[PDB]
C-alpha cells in the first residue's frame, strides 16, 4: 500500500523537503540513504514511502516540479537533498508569474508530458498502489496551474485510486499576492470536480499557533513546515505500523464524506506544548482531546461555533486503553450535542496505533468536516465579484487566451457549493 | 522412522543455507559495482 508524493511550486517543494526530513528521521534513514535504525518495526513497512536501491540505499517516491529551478537548487543544497533522485526534478526555463493561465496553458502544456512520464514510472513500480498525495498553494501560479493540470491527468489515468491534496489558502487579513481571488476561484472549481479529499491551511492560523501556543521568540518557515509535515506524516501512520484498530485513507474518506461535493476538511494536531509549561500538565487522553477540540489548535480561520460538525476523525498513536478513547468521544458528543448534526447518530470515528512519534509518549491528528468552511468560499466569491465587475486585472488572463465564460462557471459552481453547505446546515428531520 | 526424520532435518538445513547464499552474492556484486563507479568518477575529475 504505497503512496506517491508530488511537490509543486515553491511552497510545495519546501514543505516536501521538511516532510521527507521528518519521515527519514522516523524510520532512521541516514541522509546518505543507509538504514541505521534500531527496530525491525521500522524496516517492515519502509516500502510504503521508499524504494530500495542496491546495497542498502533507499530513494523517496516523490516528483518535484517547478517552472524555475531556484527552489530546487535550494533543496538540493540542503542537508537531506542528496536523497532525491536526479531524474525526478522537472523544470522549465521561465517562471509562472503568479498567473493561473500561464501556469496552466503555456508552460504547463510544454512540461506536462515529462511529468506524466515520471508519475507513471513511479506509480507502476509499486506492488499495490494507494492514493496520490499532492502539496501546493492555491494562490500561486505554478502551484495552482500545474497542480490542477496534473490532478486532472492523473484522474484520467488512475480513476479508481484516491486523490489527496494539501493546500494553502489566502489569509483573510493580509494578501501575499494581489491576484489571489482569480487563482483561488479557478483552483477550487478544478478541485471540486477532480479531488476526493482536500485539506486547507491558513498561514495566519499557523502564526497564531506558534506565537500563542508555542510562544516561539523568532519563528521561521521551517517551524510552520515542520508542523505541517508532522500532521501529514501522522494521517498515514496507521497505514505503516501495527495497532489495535487499523485504519486507511479510504476508510477516512468513506467515514468523512456524506455527499460527494462535501469533501473539504479542517485539520489539527494536538500535543503542542508551550516552551515553558510542560511541568504544569501531564499527558493523558483527556488532555489530548481537550487540545484536539480547541479552535486555537485548528489550522484554518473559520470557527466551529458558527457551524455544525457533520463528521470528524481522530487517529491516536501510543499505548492506551480503548475504553478511554470511546468514553471521551461519547462524553464530547453528549455534552456539546447542539454542534453535531442530529440526523447522524455518531459523527466521530476513532483509530488507535501502537507506535508514537519519537520523543512523544502519545499523539493524535484530528480531521474535521464542518459547514463553517462555507464562510471562506463566500469571502472569496465576494472578492472575485469585486474584481471581475471592473475587469481589474483581466487582460492578462484574456490575453493568454482564457474565455471569460470560464470565470462565470467557476463562480457559479462555488456559489452552489456555498448554497449546498447552507442547505445541509439548516436541514431538519420533520 | 528415526533415520527418515534426521535425513529430513539435514535437507531443511541445506535449503536454508542456499537461500542465504543467494542474498550474500547479491550484496557482493553491489559492492563491486559501487567501487567501479568510484574509479570512473575519479578519472573524469582528473581529465577535467
Amino acid at each position: 500500500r504505497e503512496i506517491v508524493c508530488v511537490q509543486a511550486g515553491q511552497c510545495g517543494n519546501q514543505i516536501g523537503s521538511k516532510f521527507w526530513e521528518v519521515i527519514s528521521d522516523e524510520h532512521g534513514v541516514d541522509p546518505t540513504g543507509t538504514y541505521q535504525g534500531d527496530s525491525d518495526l521500522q524496516l517492515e513497512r519502509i516500502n510504503v514511502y521508499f524504494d530500495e536501491a542496491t546495497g542498502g540505499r533507499y530513494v523517496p517516491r516523490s516528483v518535484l516540479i517547478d517552472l524555475e529551478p531556484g527552489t530546487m537548487d535550494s533543496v538540493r543544497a540542503g542537508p537531506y537533498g542528496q536523497i532525491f533522485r536526479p531524474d525526478n526534478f522537472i523544470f522549465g526555463q521561465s517562471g509562472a508569474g503568479n498567473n493561473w493561465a500561464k501556469g496552466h496553458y503555456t508552460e504547463g502544456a510544454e512540461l506536462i508530458d515529462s511529468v506524466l512520464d515520471v508519475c507513471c514510472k513511479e506509480a507502476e513500480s509499486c506492488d499495490c498502489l494507494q492514493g496520490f498525495q499532492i502539496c501546493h498553494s492555491l494562490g500561486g501560479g505554478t502551484g495552482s496551474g500545474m497542480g490542477t493540470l496534473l490532478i486532472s491527468k492523473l484522474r484520467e489515468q488512475y480513476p479508481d485510486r484516491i486523490m489527496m491534496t494539501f493546500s494553502i489558502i489566502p489569509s483573510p487579513k493580509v494578501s501575499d499576492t494581489v491576484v489571489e481571488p482569480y487563482n483561488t476561484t479557478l483552483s477550487v472549481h478544478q478541485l471540486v470536480e477532480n479531488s476526493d479529499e482536500s485539506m486547507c491551511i491558513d498561514n495566519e492560523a499557523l502564526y497564531d499557533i506558534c506565537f500563542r501556543t508555542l510562544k516561539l521568540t523568532t519563528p521561521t518557515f521551517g517551524d510552520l513546515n515542520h508542523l505541517v509535515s508532522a500532521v501529514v506524516s501522522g494521517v498515514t501512520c496507521c497505514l505503516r505500523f501495527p495497532g489495535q484498530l487499523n485504519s486507511d485513507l479510504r476508510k477516512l474518506a468513506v467515514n468523512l464524506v456524506p455527499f460527494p461535493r462535501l469533501h473539504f476538511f479542517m485539520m489539527g494536531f494536538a500535543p503542542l506544548t508551550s516552551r515553558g509549561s510542560q511541568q504544569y500538565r501531564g499527558l493523558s487522553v483527556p488532555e489530548l482531546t481537550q487540545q484536539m477540540f480547541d479552535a486555537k489548535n485548528m489550522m484554518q480561520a473559520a470557527d466551529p461555533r458558527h457551524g455544525r460538525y457533520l463528521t470528524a476523525s481522530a487517529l491516536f498513536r501510543g499505548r492506551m486503553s480503548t475504553k478511554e478513547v470511546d468514553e471521551q468521544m461519547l462524553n464530547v458528543q453528549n455534552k456539546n450535542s447542539s454542534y453535531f448534526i442530529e440526523w447522524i447518530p455518531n459523527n466521530i470515528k476513532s483509530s488507535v496505533c501502537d507506535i508514537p512519534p519519537k520523543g512523544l509518549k502519545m499523539a493524535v491528528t484530528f480531521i474535521g468536516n464542518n459547514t463553517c468552511i462555507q464562510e471562506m468560499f463566500r469571502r472569496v466569491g465576494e472578492q472575485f465579484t469585486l474584481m471581475f465587475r471592473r475587469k481589474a486585472f483581466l487582460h492578462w488572463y484574456t490575453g493568454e487566451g482564457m474565455d471569460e465564460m470560464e470565470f462565470t462557471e467557476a463562480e457559479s459552481n462555488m456559489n452552489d457549493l456555498v448554497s449546498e453547505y447552507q442547505q445541509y446546515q439548516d436541514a431538519t428531520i420533520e | 522412522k528415526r533415520k527418515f526424520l534426521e535425513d529430513r532435518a539435514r535437507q531443511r538445513d541445506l535449503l536454508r543455507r542456499r537461500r542465504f547464499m543467494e542474498v550474500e552474492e547479491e550484496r557482493r556484486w553491489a559492492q563491486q559495482d559501487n567501487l567501479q563507479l568510484r574509479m570512473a568518477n575519479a578519472l573524469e575529475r582528473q581529465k577535467e
Partner: protein
C-alpha cells in the same frame, strides 16, 4: 581493554513537532548555487578510491 581504531558515532536528538529554534538564521552568507541548468552530473557525491 582499550577502544580500537574506529570511532564512536553520535546520533542527534529527535525532531519533536514543536521546540525548534531558528538555526537557519545563524548563517552570514546566503549565496545560491545553480545546479539544475548548468551541471550535468548535479551535486552527486561519489567517494574516493
Amino acid at each position: 581493554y582499550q577502544q580500537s581504531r574506529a570511532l564512536k558515532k553520535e546520533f542527534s536528538l529527535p525532531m519533536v513537532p514543536g521546540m525548534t529554534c531558528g538555526e537557519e538564521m545563524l548563517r552570514r552568507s546566503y549565496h545560491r548555487t545553480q545546479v539544475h541548468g548548468r551541471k550535468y552530473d548535479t551535486n552527486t557525491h561519489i567517494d574516493g578510491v
